[PDB]
Design a protein around this nucleic acid. Structure first.
Lengths: 82, 676, 70, 99, 92, 252
RNA sequence: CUCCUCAUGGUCAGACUAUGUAGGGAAUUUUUGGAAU
């Protein structure tokens, strides 16, 4: 498995932000992250490239479609320094 | 000198404006001391120069002449590990080295715990030099950097000097020094001792493991013999890394080596070596190839008999690889011979390879002194007039026979007995075979078997025979045999005379019982019977001979064997087995031939691993230039078509500069011949 | 890529956006984790502080040595 | 066989890599990964006005093509892997030869 | 055995065009995804259609403030990725 | 003492064979006589030490000219730990595996000393008995007296009483050696010739001298053997402890 | 050089780690392109 996959699994239960290949940003609490980067998310606030913002309850996006994630700074401590 | 003769001590002064005699006098002075050091060959009045092996070594490793003669005397047959360092220290390049008072404390600490003892003492610079050498082998970096500067000098020039000493001893043929020196050279190269395990020179082998093996007090052969990886980890008592260690072991050189010696004659002794290489290759660790020095040394390990460097390439590892060489013996060692000679293989790089297999002499009994060939009497008087029918005299396009052919002619052309005609390439064996054939025809016999192993010269000889021999007897059918057993059988019937290689005619004659034509063959010419020595084919050709003799005895048949061959020392025995008599046998020496021929053999260095080198090429061009400037015509032989092309372009380059590119003919004539 | 570890690196994305951050770890897919990562778009103009980010290896074009590690 | 190995041979070579995005790269290959990820040093890079960069690592799939020096010996570099595979793969009458 | 089958399938498949190109040292023209074309000789190939091409002449089409113009350049030693290949044409 | 002075002194050992003489005993065909070559002896002298006793086994067979003559073809150098005037030696070697052994009989053993005796001392006789107790009664011994400038070959035999004495008396036993006295040993017939030559067998580890390897030596224990060239008593292979101590002098 | 697979030697109660004449890194979530304009 990937070390960043391992971190991303640690990120479960936290509030993360996600940018997809389309450019829409989904901020919310990450329920579940599979090995394939498929992520289940809660109470998501979404900002579109046009600037419009919406709210949704439960969202699940495919791994392949995710440009990148931003995860909280708490995890930066360890154990990935090694 | 020209500018100021008396300043630089020219006595000649007014005499010799060009200082011819001054130059020549300096050369004289140089070549005396060089000759004393056996660097070059020189003679005062005749004035001929040539380079020796020691001189070549000094040239290669750029040893000063003083260092050179120091090596010459100080190295000895019995010199040991302690003396080797001393000699190294004595090397003239260290004359400028001297002990220092700030160096002296560390020196004092060293020389107590130094493994290799020192015959000299702290005040003497030589002792400082070889203790620095020891430190270098043992990997000691230093705080006080005066010592460290000196040891840098030793670092850069040490492997050089040691390697030179080793080559010198190898030329001398000394057994005790050469092995230890080879170990030292290896230690300068790889920076370690023998007691430090060879796993150190692997880049990937870890530190804890090598410490553990150093401290474990175990023979190296045992670790090498261990196979099971888990069992290796248990043996090295750390479970971790064991698999890695075993992988690296199979990457360490391991040889199952065998040698079968065998005498060619009493003086010359040939050794057939079987060298197997079990290790697995790596381009990173091993490099391009593996040079391995093969030493043939006596039963003591005192003096070297014979040596060669051999390259083990990636292709050879694991194959069953035979290596052959010859050695001439001594007079006393010839008379009484030892129980065995030692054959030892050492890696120029890898540590503690040390594969020594005894070369077994147990009841090896040498044969008798070589018997001389039958003498050449003085008679020329035999000629084409002696033979009976004058239709056979229009054949040879000459009248008087040769000196060697005149000797054999009486037993050959007159009687019908079994003749060993024998020797020489230049003296026509073709002609003597022709005479034998004529004698055979003369008696109304008609079946003739001419057997030469060289299939291309068979065809030439057929072309010459069919146009002339066949028509004079007037009916006789001369043929060459083809690949088919059926076709060469039908030829065996149709044709009076058959020409074939030993393989062909042995294959056809294998059923003599079933083919009754072969039971009836009256006369045979075995041409070039000296090629029975040649590989398996010679064995085929003696199978054919033996079969024919067995047929003669079994069928009570009178079969005339004419054995044509080259000069052979064991020839008379060979004729004896063929149903011959000492009077019928004629063996001559190679010197008996009628065109005195100088065999000039010239030996060059580092050529064993190559087809030719550039000095060989130059010398060949020089010889060719001598012949071409003379009226003589000359030819050069080469291993391949590729090699011929390379040498051709090379020759053209040599010629274009010098006066002679000459074809001894105009440039406009040659294109009409080569139009194709 | 292991030498680049802990360094400040500049990664160029597939869309042309420029990200800059400390390279803490990678993987086979070249998915990178970037600490204290900020985004620049046009060249400073339109710079944003993202923080700790993963980037996908499918989106990454190239990376260059920006500055020394903290 | 695998051309990526041929790229592995290309260390310390000065090349100009055109990329799928149109970017031009000029630099000395320090190494190429089997992914065809190419790490280079002393690189001038032109995006579709050159930027000079000490080191550049490029993801292999982004590489469009790599233009090699004309001096390169392709005959020698192409034939390796077959020889390596042959190396991985690898009685009385022995001496046809005599005395 | 598996290796044998792969080489054979390669020989009698569509791959035969680039195999034939390497053996005959014949020029082929490659329409790429950049809308550029490469007419060259095939020095080496790969299952991915990675290629070593010699005597490369690449032709492209450019638009300006007037009539469209074709542009072309010579690259003697060119190595090409396998995904940029749209089409490999073999012709006289 | 230690390695330095004796090891440096070892180089001069080739000089000890320039002069070779023995007190010449009457030649008698009644008992078997031995023929020893000049090269094997020389090599053994080279490998040996000026102080410490070095001792190997010696093997050969009877030639067909005289069955009573015994030609020493094969010296066999064995695992041992030597002292001044005494030595510890392993068992009788099992050499059947090697070639050039077709019924090679066990002739005896050879050793070095510095004292000129007409008899075998306690440390020697006891060792002899321990080697050959129930195995071969009539085997012989070669005691080489060595001093700078010349060496001397003193051959000896043994009767059945000495074996009993060695069986009973192993450690110390100086008084029972004194009572043992000169008489039991009988001067065996030995010759030195350049008309024949011989070879060495050595252990598989190629370290015969266990002087500084104290843990590895075993007085009764099995070892593989091979033909080869033996090393010096003080040689790099025999002195591994010194290199770890030499680099350990500077440390790290 | 990297990841996986496999093999392996070890350790722990499948995981981890060193090594490997090993296999591999083009058919949906990454490296053989849906990009091009």
């Amino acid at each position: 498995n990937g070390i960043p996959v391992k971190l991303l699994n640690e990120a479960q239960g936290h509030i993360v932000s996600l940018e997809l290949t389309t450019g829409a940003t989904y901020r919310g609490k990450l329920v579940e992250s599979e090995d394939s980067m498929n992520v289940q998310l809660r109470d998501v606030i979404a900002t579109e490239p046009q600037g419009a913002v919406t709210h949704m309850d439960q969202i699940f996006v495919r791994g392949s479609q995710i440009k990148f994630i931003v995860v909280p700074d708490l995890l930066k401590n360890a154990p990935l320094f090694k | 000198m020209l500018a100021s003769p008396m300043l630089y001590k020219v006595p000649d002064i007014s005499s010799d404006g060009q200082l011819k005699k001054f130059r020549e006098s300096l050369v004289h002075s140089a070549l005396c001391i060089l000759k004393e050091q056996e660097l070059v060959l020189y003679d005062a009045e005749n004035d001929v120069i040539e380079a020796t092996d020691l001189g070549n070594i000094a040239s290669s490793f750029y040893i000063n002449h003083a260092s050179m003669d120091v090596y010459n005397r100080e190295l000895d047959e019995h010199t040991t590990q302690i003396d080797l360092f001393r000699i190294f220290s004595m090397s003239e390049e260290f004359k400028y080295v001297s002990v220092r008072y700030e160096e002296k404390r560390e020196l004092k600490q060293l020389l107590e715990k130094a493994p290799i003892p020192i015959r000299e003492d702290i005040d003497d610079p030589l002792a400082k030099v070889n203790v620095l050498l020891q430190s270098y082998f043992s990997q000691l970096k230093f705080e006080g950097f005066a010592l460290n500067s000196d040891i840098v000098f030793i670092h850069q020039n040490a492997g050089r000097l040691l390697r030179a000493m080793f080559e010198i001893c190898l030329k001398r043929g000394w057994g005790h020094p050469t092995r230890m020196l080879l170990n030292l050279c290896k230690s300068a190269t790889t920076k370690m001792w023998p007691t430090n395990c060879p796993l150190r020179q692997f880049k990937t082998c870890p530190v804890e493991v090598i410490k553990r093996l150093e401290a474990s007090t175990v023979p190296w052969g045992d670790y090498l013999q261990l196979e099971t990886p888990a069992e290796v980890g248990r043996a090295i008592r750390s479970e971790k890394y064991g698999k890695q260690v075993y992988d690296l072991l199979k990457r360490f050189p391991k040889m199952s080596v065998t040698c079968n010696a065998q005498p060619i004659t009493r003086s010359v002794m040939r050794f057939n070596i079987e060298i197997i290489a079990d290790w697995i290759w790596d381009m990173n660790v091993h490099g391009s190839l593996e040079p391995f020095l093969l030493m043939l040394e006596d039963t003591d390990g005192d003096s070297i008999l014979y040596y060669d460097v051999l390259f083990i390439t990636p292709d050879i590892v694991g194959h069953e690889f035979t290596l052959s060489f010859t050695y001439e013996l001594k007079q006393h060692n010839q008379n009484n011979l030892p129980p065995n000679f030692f054959l030892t293989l050492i890696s120029e790089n890898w540590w503690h390879s040390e594969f020594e297999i005894p070369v077994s002499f147990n009841g090896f009994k040498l044969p008798k002194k070589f018997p001389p060939p039958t003498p050449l009497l003085e008679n020329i008087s035999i000629s084409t007039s002696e033979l009976g029918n004058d239709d056979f005299s229009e054949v040879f396009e000459f009248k008087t026979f040769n000196k060697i052919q005149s000797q054999v002619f009486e037993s050959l052309y007159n009687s019908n007995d079994s003749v060993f005609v024998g020797s020489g390439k230049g003296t026509g064996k073709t002609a003597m075979a022709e005479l034998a054939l004529l004698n055979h025809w003369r008696q109304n016999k008609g079946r003739a078997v001419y057997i030469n192993p060289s299939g291309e010269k068979i065809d030439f000889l057929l072309s010459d025979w069919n146009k002339r021999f066949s028509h004079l007897a007037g009916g006789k059918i001369i043929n060459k045999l083809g690949n088919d057993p059926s076709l060469n059988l039908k030829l065996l019937a149709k044709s009076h005379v058959l020409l074939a290689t030993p393989v062909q005619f042995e294959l056809l004659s294998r059923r003599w019982r079933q083919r009754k034509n072969i039971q009836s063959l009256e006369l045979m010419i075995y041409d070039d019977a000296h090629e029975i020595s040649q590989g398996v084919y010679g064995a085929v050709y003696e199978t054919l001979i033996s079969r024919m003799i067995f047929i003669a005895t079994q069928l009570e048949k009178k079969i005339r064997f004419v054995c044509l061959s080259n000069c052979l020392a064991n020839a008379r025995d060979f004729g004896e087995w063929a149903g011959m008599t000492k009077s019928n046998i004629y063996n001559f020496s190679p010197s008996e031939r009628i065109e005195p021929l100088e065999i000039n053999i010239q030996s060059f260095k580092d050529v064993e691993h190559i087809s030719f080198n550039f000095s060989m090429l130059q010398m060949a061009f020089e010889a060719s230039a001598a012949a071409a400037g003379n009226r003589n015509s000359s030819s050069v032989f080469l291993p391949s078509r590729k090699d011929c092309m390379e040498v051709a372009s090379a020759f053209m380059k040599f010629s274009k500069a010098i006066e002679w590119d000459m074809l001894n003919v105009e440039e406009e004539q040659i294109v009409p011949y080569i139009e194709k | 890529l292991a030498n680049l570890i802990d360094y400040k690196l500049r990664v160029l994305t597939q869309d042309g956006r420029v990200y800059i951050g400390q390279l803490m770890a990678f993987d086979k897919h070249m998915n990178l984790v970037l600490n204290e990562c900020i985004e620049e778009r046009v060249p400073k103009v339109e710079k944003r502080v993202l923080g700790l980010t993963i980037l996908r290896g499918e989106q990454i074009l190239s990376t260059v040595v920006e500055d020394k590690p903290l | 066989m695998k051309l990526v190995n041929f790229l592995k041979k290309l260390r310390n070579e000065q090349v100009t890599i055109e990329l799928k995005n149109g970017t031009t790269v000029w630099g000395t290959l320090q190494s190429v990964s089997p992914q065809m990820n190419a790490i280079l040093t002393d690189v001038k890079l032109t995006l579709p006005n050159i930027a000079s960069l000490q080191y550049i690592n490029i993801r292999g799939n982004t590489i469009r093509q790599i233009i090699l020096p004309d001096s390169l010996n392709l005959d020698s570099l192409l034939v390796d892997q077959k020889q390596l595979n042959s190396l991985r793969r690898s009685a009385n009458k022995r001496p046809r030869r005599g005395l | 055995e598996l290796e044998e089958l792969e080489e054979f399938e390669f020989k009698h498949g569509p791959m035969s065009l680039i195999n034939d190109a390497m053996v005959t040292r014949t020029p082929v023209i490659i329409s790429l995804r950049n809308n550029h074309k490469i007419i060259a000789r095939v020095k080496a190939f790969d299952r991915h259609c990675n290629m070593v091409l010699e005597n490369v002449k690449e032709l492209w089409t450019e638009k300006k403030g007037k009539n469209v113009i074709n542009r072309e350049r010579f690259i003697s030693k060119l190595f090409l990725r396998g995904d940029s290949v749209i089409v490999v044409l073999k012709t006289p | 003492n230690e390695w330095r002075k004796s090891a440096i002194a070892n180089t001069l050992l080739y000089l000890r064979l320039k002069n070779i003489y023995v007190s010449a005993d009457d030649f008698v065909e009644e008992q078997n006589v031995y023929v020893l070559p000049k090269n094997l002896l020389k090599k053994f002298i080279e490998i040996s030490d000026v102080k410490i006793q070095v001792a190997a086994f010696i093997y050969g067979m009877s030639a067909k000219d005289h069955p009573k003559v015994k030609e020493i073809k094969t010296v066999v150098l064995v695992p041992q730990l030597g002292h001044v005037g005494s030595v510890q030696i392993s068992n009788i070697p099992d050499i059947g595996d090697l070639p050039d052994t077709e019924g090679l009989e066990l002739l005896g053993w050879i050793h070095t000393q510095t004292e000129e005796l007409k008899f075998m001392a306690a440390s020697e006789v006891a060792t002899h008995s321990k080697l050959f107790a129930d195995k071969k009664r009539d085997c012989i011994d070669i005691s080489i007296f060595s001093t700078p400038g010349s060496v001397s070959l003193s051959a000896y035999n043994l009767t059945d009483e000495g074996y009993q004495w060695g069986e009973e008396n192993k450690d110390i036993m100086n008084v029972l050696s004194e009572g043992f006295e000169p008489t039991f040993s009988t001067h065996a017939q030995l010759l030195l010739s350049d008309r024949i030559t011989g070879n060495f067998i050595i252990p598989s580890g190629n370290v015969w001298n266990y002087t500084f390897m104290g843990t590895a030596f075993n007085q009764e224990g099995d070892y593989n053997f091979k033909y080869g060239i033996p090393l010096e008593f003080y040689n790099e292979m025999h002195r591994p402890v010194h290199f770890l101590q030499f680099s350990e002098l500077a440390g790290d």
